[PDB]
Amino acid sequence: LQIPFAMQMAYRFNGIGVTQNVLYENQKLIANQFNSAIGKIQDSLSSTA
Amino acid sequence: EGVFVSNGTHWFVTQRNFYEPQIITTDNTFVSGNCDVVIGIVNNTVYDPLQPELDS
Ligand SMILES: *[C@@H]1O[C@H](CO)[C@@H](O)[C@H](O)[C@H]1NC(C)=O
């Protein structure tokens, strides 16, 4: 069943006991922190065999 | 405890796992802040159940 990804992450936030407005009010910070954390996976594997 | 959903013209709040649409109300919703922040917020009325009693 399709759902917009920012609304899926708002459900993932309710699932951890954080109110879902915390995601919609911080969405660009949360996306930046995620994209940065995925970037560190590339660097860790591109060095630490 | 739901999602906001539209049949194309009207807006309803639904429980997330079974389609049962309800009128959007102060009692099935909560406030936080103002419209300037949220990416993709929509304009629709929210009903207040006190007012048509207080209007008696
Ligand atoms: C969805 O994307 C469109 C552009 O294709 C944008 O105008 C709209 O505001 C977005 N809506 C939501 C709910 O993110």
Swiss-Prot record, chain A:
It comes from the Viruses. Subunit of the fusion protein that is processed upon entry into the host cell. Mediates fusion of the virion and cellular membranes by functioning as a class I viral fusion protein. Contains a viral fusion peptide that is unmasked after S2 cleavage. This cleavage can occur at the cell membrane by host TMPRSS2 or during endocytosis by host CSTL. In either case, this triggers an extensive and irreversible conformational change that leads to fusion of the viral envelope with the cellular cytoplasmic membrane, releasing viral genomic RNA into the host cell cytoplasm. This is Spike protein S2'. It comes from Severe acute respiratory syndrome coronavirus 2. The chain holds residues 894 to 942 of 1273 of the full protein.
Swiss-Prot record, chain B:
The chain holds residues 1092 to 1147 of 1273 of the full protein. It comes from the Viruses. This is Spike protein S2'. It comes from Severe acute respiratory syndrome coronavirus 2 (2019-nCoV). The gene is S. Subunit of the fusion protein that is processed upon entry into the host cell. Mediates fusion of the virion and cellular membranes by functioning as a class I viral fusion protein. Contains a viral fusion peptide that is unmasked after S2 cleavage. This cleavage can occur at the cell membrane by host TMPRSS2 or during endocytosis by host CSTL. In either case, this triggers an extensive and irreversible conformational change that leads to fusion of the viral envelope with the cellular cytoplasmic membrane, releasing viral genomic RNA into the host cell cytoplasm. Changing residue 10 to Y: In strain: Theta/P.3. The lineage of its organism: Viruses, Riboviria, Orthornavirae, Pisuviricota, Pisoniviricetes. Glycans are attached at residues 7, 43.
